[model samples]
Target chain A: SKPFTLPILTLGELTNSRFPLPIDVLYTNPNESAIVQCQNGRCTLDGELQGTTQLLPTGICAFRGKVTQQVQDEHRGTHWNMTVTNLNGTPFDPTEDVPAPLGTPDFSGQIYGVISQRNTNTEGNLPANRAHEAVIATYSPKFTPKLGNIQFSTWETQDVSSGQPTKFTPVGLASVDANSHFDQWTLPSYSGALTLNMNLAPSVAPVFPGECLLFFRSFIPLKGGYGNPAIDCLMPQEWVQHLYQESAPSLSDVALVRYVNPETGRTLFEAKLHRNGFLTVARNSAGPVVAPTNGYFRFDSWVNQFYTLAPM
Target chain B: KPFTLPILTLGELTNSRFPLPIDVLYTNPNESAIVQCQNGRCTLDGELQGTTQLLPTGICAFRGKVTQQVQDEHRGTHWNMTVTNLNGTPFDPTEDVPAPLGTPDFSGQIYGVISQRNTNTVPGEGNLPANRAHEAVIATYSPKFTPKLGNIQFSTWETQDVSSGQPTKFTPVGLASVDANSHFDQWTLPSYSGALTLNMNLAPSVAPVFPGECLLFFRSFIPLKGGYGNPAIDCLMPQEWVQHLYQESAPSLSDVALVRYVNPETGRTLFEAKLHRNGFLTVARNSAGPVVAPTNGYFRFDSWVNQFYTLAPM
Candidate 1:
């Protein structure tokens, strides 16, 4: 009903969208995730010129960008909801890859973007996605890979830098990004107050170590704030996948966390799975092992081995 | 005697090196010089071609251009190589391009082929010789393609003797690379836990692309130790093999471990959980057991790393 403003876009975001990644990105594994990258805008690997038609006076549009999926076809796009502003909380152009609006209150604008079905041509209802609840936080203050087609509203609260506990409690109702650097889940449509913060915790916010998901409930109100971001902690949220009760924990196997003395729980020897498959618990005068013990364990198969950003 | 084919003089016989370095038949069936082997700075003549370089050893380099231009930087540089017949292919009886490519996994064993042509084709014929000489021999080498350098075609050559597949084959060797970027090959997966395979994008090519030719390929070189932590054949992996195997970015929590104390009198044990790698694990509890919290027990971790903590996760 009103004059809708355009969404703010980042070079990283546009290129990181679904469909057309850097246009020239032939292939990108997180290892390939980064630009073979020419600094001064030279060219790209998949080749170049894909976005020549997409170029605007400001920058390119993210509508036709890469969705960062495990496969090629799953990428969706164009659902951009950007509100650009400057130092005094005034409006600014969203497309320009510019620096922060400087002056007295000099700062970067708060941003929000989710896996939206930007493909306007598609009929029926589109999946909703608002990176976060508050308007103050950037879609991903610290950019990382994102996954999922479900709509998810994200935002940063007033306590911008203080750092909130980056943990989330993704209830069954919400569609969560099980895969991602952060615990990302769709914040259920704006529910009333108290509903979100009511002592909700699936025991420790459903977290582990490697890159796993934890949906934070961030539905913001006019003045109040809401956020409990899922921090990648730049650490993987790993867990034991294929564990076993070994009579002799083969020196050949691997384990992230091994119970050296399972029955007693004493030895926490820095261990390693020998090429032979045994989890070496302690170093004996003869070799690495704690006790004559058969251990229960599994290893990290890299089942979720994609970019922290390129989550499903 | 059926007019005993008068063999050439000594130089042609075992007594000799062949009747005058015998003008070798050096091209694959299609004239694709996918491989280029030289004897004593020998120049490629008669159909197959090249501007001669100084001598090193009988250099068997994979050719970059025939019809489509195939190649490897590690042509002459790769460690083990031998010589014979001016024609790089095996004997003329077998110089063929191969019946296309095969699957990435052969009998759960990884298999790969290259789009990069070779210089070892029989001249005029442009095909790999029928003999085994042209066949790529699996030697001391690693084949990871990741940590890859974009645009640049991989110079490292990889091969496999599959237990299956049609007789279809050709040993398309790569060049000797002064720059061996990163290896995506030597896959040291999760200690034999599951069936894991390393993969990466490969350059597309003309001609019938072998299995190795594609947008994706699995690093198919097995080791003395494969997944499930079984030691099979013996092979010396590169020194940093652990890294590619683990694909880990940092050192795992080494010091942090679950330790227990002995109740001096009872001769029983006490429980304690350490949170820090260097953090205290001995938080004296009533006893010890399993833990869900990573920081609760030596906290669940058993000195785990992808591959001894080296495999760089894609």
Candidate 2:
């Protein structure tokens, strides 16, 4: 055959052209559901899913999820919503018996499912049974102070030999009246000073008493000193025992005079109480009980003004 | 307290009036020395003792320094002159010289004068030295073409007579020379039903010319079916010659009558070497060629094909 003749083509037109392809694909799991809520510490998916409840101290039930049904809304733009079913559940074991001072438990395993959005057409999908969903909760405990008992004792005597007047020498003067029983004596106003000495039994415990209270009444002479001394005031003083746990055999104490004015019906003054030397005389010992060689429980008192008013 | 001079008693007691001769003072001869006051209405004796010369009231010597000097060639003199203040002691033209003169004791002095002639005379007005000289060179640029000698001829064959009656036919014999120098030639090929064919050896030394170089080939007439005809012209392109020189073998269809040849490998017509009407054939070694076929031509051949050529140093 004769040689074939082919058409000639130019190079200029062939250089300015382009070729391209157009298609894209994406993949995602709609069953994976995630919630954003806050607890005592933070509100993040990873933190909420993995953190120990004890370290966080407090728990919040804000965000919870159980993938229920994947639903797609037509009116809204293309986005899948992995449906969440049950939202309320806690991973803590309330019945798991434990001792006091128990801390919060990790509730991370209670997550039943996650919600996810995959593509334009697909909605969020959920697990068949959303049983183990969880939330956060908090716990707290209570405390208080206790009460103790208080007791005291006393002894007394008098002398009339050296012209020192033997006035009413009230021995074992425990109480003058039933209501005014002298477990503790609240003093009355005399213009000068007064003192009280006492021998205390060694067995009394030095514990703070709940009702460390003293009660008393006072009398003041009238203007011309003609009428009966008037009962003008009653007063109470609070007492606090020393916080000592030591066991000593004997105890000597002095009660400084504390006064309430009978004329004004107000407290005039008070003296500080003290402990002097030991009164070692046993309460059951026989023989004429001579005062203990030690100046037995000596205490002094004073007043800012002097008067001849008699204390009734 | 004022004290009275001792009274001259003896002679003055006589109350004599002895008139003291008025001291006569002479005037200076130099006009510059004469002192005139009150617009020349009042005159004072001159400082120099000589004939007095009339002087104006405010005329004073110019006091200044000789700041600038101007030399005049034609006048043959140099003027040393000041340019500033002109009224002060030990005078300066540009500033005040702080020297005072009371009785003409010219100790620290300054002056200006004009000096006389010099050698190098100044040029006249508007005259100056001539301008500097220079030279120039020129050159021309152009393209040139040179032609070398080689065996020039057209492919031809001996004529054959067809006498028989069975469709009388003639066959190609061989190439033949028509001129003595071998530069011109006529060729006759055997006759056929439609066309004739011819083959000729182009000289091996005929180097292909460059682009724009002219190629002229003259074809002498030969007896074709009758008598001799006029000669025809033909041209070969430089590109065609280059292609032929580089190629291992000769191309087909060298008859010059076909006007077109298909390339064996490409299966496309490489070119159409058409003959013009003026019996002259021409071809350019370029990518494009003319469409019009020339007329008034007996026989012509023109073609363009790429070929290699080499040149030795002269």
Candidate 3:
């Protein structure tokens, strides 16, 4: 399905209009086939009164309208897809102004993928304890001023070996490709540019284990700035942390950290090894966490231990 | 640990070398002078010209010279300055010092003055420690100061020195992530199209425009052989620089020097900020054709947000 996202930079004043000032907003189409209706001076999803009108503190109202735009895909394929929104005010009227169908109120989007390991070497295999392994993801999500839904369905790799040392092999060839099509799930009340409360669990009783499910929610913000983004997966049990950022030289440039001990776990001797030539050390003497000191993490020192890190 | 002097050198990749280009002198904001090196000696030449006084003593005295202008593939043309004397007194190299001069000496480290290109004439005892030995002062040479760019460290002060009384000969390190009032000057771009995040320090009220705040001058995208793509997601200029440009520069506020969005391919101006007859700058995208906004949104100059008006349908 074609998904559309656009940033309405500004909603200037209205002329010859009785509505309040227009607001800059982020619009997302919840459903592909849904129709847009503007009735009684407000836009609604499928003409539904609920979730249609919410007034801001400034006395201005907000709603969604279906605005389709012809755009080129990544491969330069030209197509007309329904962009989620149209920003403007409407006058109160008993009759409805029907645009394209806003379809059913399905705000959730499916994000499916598989859990794979970066390094397959014995040293880089996934640790056994839940504390040691973390599924870190780096994504640049758009800011959402409004609420929406998100869902995740990630396939777990088959365990290569049995006990303490864990290695994962890809699922089946067909299953590995287009795996997202398998599930149609939704997180009904997801909102915000960042997701702090997300859960992971096994799909089929130890099949999609706790370590497999990886998902993040995206939202557009109107003010207070947007996107100086970085995501980290803190694995306390393993005394390790994985950091990923969209703003790296390469997608593979994942920064890794193996804490000598956890913060507030007493003494701090955290060693962070950036994929770049920088090594930052965090030191604390049984108090609040101290910021890390930047230094050059030389290549020669870690040339042999490269196997211990997640692969590029 | 006894107080040991850190060896200073220029233009060698193996030792503690300064990253800025040589010959083009730089002045530390702490002083009102330029760093003058002549005949194997470097001193803060206050006699040259310019106003403003550095702390401890106004003179930034350094007893050193350019020993060797070494070249390496990894590090471009950078020279080594062996600072044998800091603040008029010659340092004791014989004490805990190794031969060949380029050894790793971390006994004592001091953050020296970095150069700026602005007319930062009005100076107080900037980040330079008030203590004599710890104080990094330089002479005022040129009336104009340079911008902090490349790998020049800016606004770093050593809080705790090895000894308070003795001259703390220190090895300079890279600028910390956060310094005096602003963030670090050196920043690496993830990509040309990535957003640049800058945290401004605005505690207790201060003027918007002034010298020493033009670090944005160096961060701007330079027009190169291959035009710089999608102007940096959101270019944040110092409010002072914005005001400075309005006063200085050519008659038009649309100075390519000030701000210009162009078609990287043909060097044609796509959108630009024009100096309005009514005073403030008026910016709009070229209405002749359709132009995609910088990856995220309209190219933003977030100095004074209220001033910008989005003129659409380009």
Q: Give the top-scoring candidate (TM-score).
A: 3
TM-score of chain B of each: 0.16, 0.13, 0.20
Q: Which stretches of candidate 2 lie over 4 Å from their true place?
A: A1-312, B1-163, B177-213, B216-314
Which prediction has more favorable lDDT, 2 or 3? 3
TM-score of every candidate: 0.17, 0.09, 0.19
Residue-level lDDT tens digits of model 2 in A1-312 = 221111111111010000000001101111213221111111111111111111100111112122222223345312111111111122323222211011111112111111111111212341111011111111100000000000111110111011110001000111122332221112111111132211111111112222111111211111110111111101100000000111122222323342343344443333322232111111222222221111111222321222111211
Report RMSD for candidate 2. 70.4
**lDDT per residue, candidate 1, B1-314, as tens digits?**
01011112111111010001111111112323121111111101111111111110111112111121223354411222121121222222122211011111111221112112122445444343211111122221333221111011222122321111112121211111112232222222111111233222211121212221111110111211011121111111110111111222234334333323233345443332222221111232222222222111111222322212221111
Every candidate's fraction of true contacts kept comes to 0.00, 0.00, 0.00
Q: Look at candidate 3 and tell me the lDDT of residue B38.
A: 13
Off by over 4 Å in 3: A1-312, B1-256, B263-268, B274-314
- The local lDDT score (0 to 100) that residue B10 gets in candidate 3 is 11
The count of backbone overlaps in candidate 1 is 133
- Candidates 2 and 3, the one with greater DockQ: 3
Docking class of 2: incorrect
